[PDB]
DNA sequence: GGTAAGC
RNA sequence: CCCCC
DNA sequence: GCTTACCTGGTG
């Protein structure tokens, strides 16, 4: 993110959410959680036809 | 008799070319033919594979490093061994000998394939072996309406399962 | 907004890592075959190798990049002047058609007027540089 | 009055952004347990 | 090309901040590649900071 | 692994060497072309010792010289002779192959051909690298040891 | 391999043998130019490329505000003013070594503990 | 629980320390290879694991 | 817009 | 289309 | 060894 420095490999910079859903996510954590969230939804959307035609 | 004269000539010269020179003229000659007599013990000019043995003896002597193989070959050092040696590597020098060890070690490390540890939890218990050495991971298999999936692996027996 | 001029110029690095003589060629609009980069530069007025080289590799100490350009120099040896280069498109009829393509259809952004060949030449050199920069693990 | 600017994704690549004016601005010159854990004024 | 890109970059940024160059025009300096990219271009998604 | 050899790591390493497809390119550090006109006396001072050997017991002034990596060579249980002989059989009586022996600091192979001459040596170096099998089975591109 | 260009026409020079005196020459194909060779080395092909250098350090590389800064003292000037980064030739097979460029004396230093690395 | 939240916070910070330590080790070209190759791949394994052990 | 079995 | 596990 | 000709989830 532009919020970090260059060459940052720290838990924070590479997507480690350290808080609980009870505590709340920081803006960065919120965005990185969204990045990895989307992951599944993409697969399920893509797979759907291939998984179907195999069934048939 | 090509080698019978050439093995000698090359041995004589590259054993006199040393800082030692030929003071042992009757012994440098004897050392050369004695090495050449047991040299023919390889094939006796019956196979060309004998010629390949010469190149080993000659090369390790010239080289520079090592210069000391020369001086110590006129001083003494086993002549029958320096034919059935195969010790092409153990003979000459020592910094290369140390380097070959480091090479061999590293290459054997390199040759081994990827491991991948996997972080385990006591929380889940296996079905078959009933052990709490479980390594999971989650994935959004269903719609955004229902939750993730959680795929557990038993790092003990090696068994895989799923969740809602 | 100069009438949907979607001209897609490609500068290809022919030949893989293992295959000898890795040649650089380019696809020109309305020009069927892929012209070797040297011939284009020659058709843009830049005639000797070394002047053509200077348009691509800005540093003389970069022996790596220059070695990759060596087979190109050889690839365009046959064409030795501008009218010879422009003819290597598609005679007389061939020479005008080429002038027009390199003028109006090649690198249409910047300018597509007439009095800028150097402007296009230097740009083609920039593309080749960025290409060779990726050919190298750079 | 040059207090606020417009930045596209290309220009963004060359800037370093603060999240909050407080959370990331004044230098350092007990803590709430209920509150979520944040980073720093790093540079 | 430009010999002192550091100064030019500042003279451009302050010129835009003043209003003299449209606030939407984008300017980037890539020190590593020795390049200065300017976009007057339509269709660029941008935010205020 | 063969029954009573399944516990020996060193056995498996040797089998690995016997299986994995090893090219000349896989062991080569670099290949050079020199104008070395005297066969009896090399322009390269390093190669002095290589000459004094493969000579003590009409060709081409153009020299193809390739340096090999000890580590690479050692991983696949190879030696200068084995490598040289493979080049000697892939080119037959067309190329003149001489080489440095197994304990010299720098591992080198010197080549000479038998109008023009120069450009056909760049041709020979391409086929040399790209397609010379030293050890191994084709298609098997990488082999790893596992426990 | 440091290749030269023909005088007169700027065109690239190619090797040629002077069999008569056993020496190498470089001739022009666009004209009748011929010059002596320097090295006997006519072509080098490198397969194994051992490099992992610093970067395109402008004597004002410090102007980059996205760069991280350390309080490590300079080995030359002893100014605790530095800007750091990883290898710029960024191969997958690269060490995580850092290159500090002191803003005061513009000298490069490495975080290396394996050897006595400055470059 | 309150003291449990203290425990959980020092746990995350403890793993974060190990990460920084494996970072400073990698940064000073001291990090060792791993059969599972690349110094970079190797560093990321150690980091990833430490942060997973932390969540768990 | 991806694979294979045609010429 | 606009909705679904 | 290149060009063709087939295909690509379920309801409403
Ligand atoms: Zn189990
Ligand atoms: Zn000339
Ligand atoms: Zn300094």
XYZ file of C-alpha atoms in Angstrom, chain F:
147
model
C 15.078 -48.025 -4.508
C 16.357 -51.622 -4.873
C 15.503 -53.538 -1.611
C 18.674 -53.546 0.552
C 19.652 -50.042 -0.665
C 16.462 -48.120 0.282
C 18.082 -46.857 3.564
C 21.336 -45.633 1.928
C 21.162 -41.920 1.025
C 24.448 -42.134 -0.975
C 23.019 -44.984 -3.140
C 19.954 -42.831 -4.029
C 22.269 -39.833 -4.926
C 24.141 -42.052 -7.447
C 20.879 -43.393 -8.886
C 19.734 -39.710 -9.179
C 22.938 -39.018 -11.229
C 22.133 -42.063 -13.443
C 18.497 -40.887 -14.102
C 18.407 -36.983 -14.361
C 19.055 -35.720 -17.902
C 22.453 -33.953 -17.918
C 23.337 -31.831 -21.006
C 26.742 -30.269 -21.796
C 24.986 -26.856 -21.279
C 24.056 -28.005 -17.730
C 27.804 -28.250 -16.766
C 29.176 -25.327 -18.901
C 30.020 -21.882 -17.280
C 30.844 -20.152 -20.550
C 32.122 -20.910 -24.073
C 34.541 -18.616 -25.956
C 36.009 -18.346 -29.500
C 39.667 -17.225 -29.840
C 42.095 -16.674 -32.694
C 44.816 -18.942 -31.273
C 46.944 -19.723 -34.371
C 49.734 -21.851 -32.881
C 48.527 -25.314 -31.730
C 51.939 -26.063 -30.077
C 51.868 -22.727 -28.123
C 48.576 -21.286 -26.775
C 47.841 -17.509 -26.688
C 46.041 -18.150 -23.334
C 48.670 -18.355 -20.537
C 46.237 -20.334 -18.356
C 46.060 -23.225 -20.957
C 49.917 -23.677 -20.908
C 49.592 -26.889 -18.793
C 46.782 -28.310 -21.086
C 49.139 -28.022 -24.078
C 52.243 -29.574 -22.365
C 50.088 -32.732 -21.823
C 47.909 -33.517 -24.970
C 51.172 -32.919 -27.034
C 54.192 -34.568 -25.208
C 53.382 -38.011 -26.801
C 46.761 -28.324 -41.055
C 44.148 -28.227 -38.173
C 42.392 -24.729 -37.548
C 43.589 -21.371 -36.009
C 40.079 -20.796 -34.574
C 39.702 -22.083 -31.015
C 36.407 -22.992 -29.254
C 37.143 -22.929 -25.508
C 34.583 -23.879 -22.872
C 34.949 -23.733 -19.091
C 33.020 -26.207 -16.915
C 31.713 -25.930 -13.285
C 33.348 -28.396 -10.834
C 30.197 -28.419 -8.659
C 27.912 -29.231 -11.664
C 30.344 -31.952 -12.895
C 30.639 -33.410 -9.355
C 26.855 -33.511 -8.668
C 26.382 -35.873 -11.666
C 29.589 -37.957 -10.893
C 31.315 -36.713 -14.168
C 34.989 -36.240 -15.246
C 36.758 -34.300 -18.032
C 37.537 -37.511 -19.944
C 33.904 -38.722 -19.976
C 32.781 -35.239 -21.208
C 35.545 -34.875 -23.770
C 34.872 -38.347 -25.185
C 31.141 -37.536 -25.549
C 32.101 -34.431 -27.671
C 34.645 -36.634 -29.527
C 31.823 -39.063 -30.485
C 29.156 -36.452 -31.337
C 31.472 -34.782 -33.953
C 33.606 -37.842 -34.979
C 36.567 -36.846 -37.245
C 35.323 -33.248 -37.866
C 36.439 -31.657 -34.574
C 39.772 -31.824 -32.664
C 39.055 -32.204 -28.948
C 41.695 -31.693 -26.210
C 40.944 -31.010 -22.501
C 42.257 -30.121 -19.039
C 42.628 -33.017 -16.594
C 40.332 -33.477 -13.534
C 42.511 -31.766 -10.860
C 43.529 -28.528 -12.633
C 42.002 -25.373 -10.946
C 40.097 -24.389 -14.155
C 38.101 -27.107 -16.027
C 38.568 -26.451 -19.801
C 37.800 -28.077 -23.187
C 39.618 -26.795 -26.337
C 38.132 -27.379 -29.825
C 39.340 -26.859 -33.386
C 37.679 -27.654 -36.743
C 39.259 -29.890 -39.485
C 36.804 -21.071 -47.611
C 35.861 -19.307 -44.256
C 36.036 -21.407 -40.849
C 34.983 -18.849 -38.108
C 31.110 -18.868 -38.336
C 30.831 -22.712 -38.473
C 32.368 -22.789 -34.952
C 29.404 -20.693 -33.584
C 27.235 -23.372 -35.326
C 29.175 -26.182 -33.566
C 28.914 -24.444 -30.146
C 25.094 -24.154 -30.499
C 24.480 -27.910 -31.175
C 27.132 -28.649 -28.499
C 25.288 -26.886 -25.717
C 21.624 -27.380 -26.755
C 21.934 -31.129 -27.544
C 24.771 -33.203 -26.073
C 23.715 -35.837 -23.547
C 26.410 -36.468 -20.919
C 24.564 -38.698 -18.390
C 20.860 -39.366 -17.647
C 17.542 -40.317 -19.362
C 15.812 -37.831 -21.732
C 12.552 -36.094 -20.715
C 13.517 -36.559 -16.988
C 14.405 -32.908 -16.429
C 14.803 -32.770 -12.584
C 15.216 -35.459 -9.893
C 14.929 -35.071 -6.104
C 15.681 -37.305 -3.108
C 12.850 -37.910 -0.586
C 12.537 -39.771 2.695
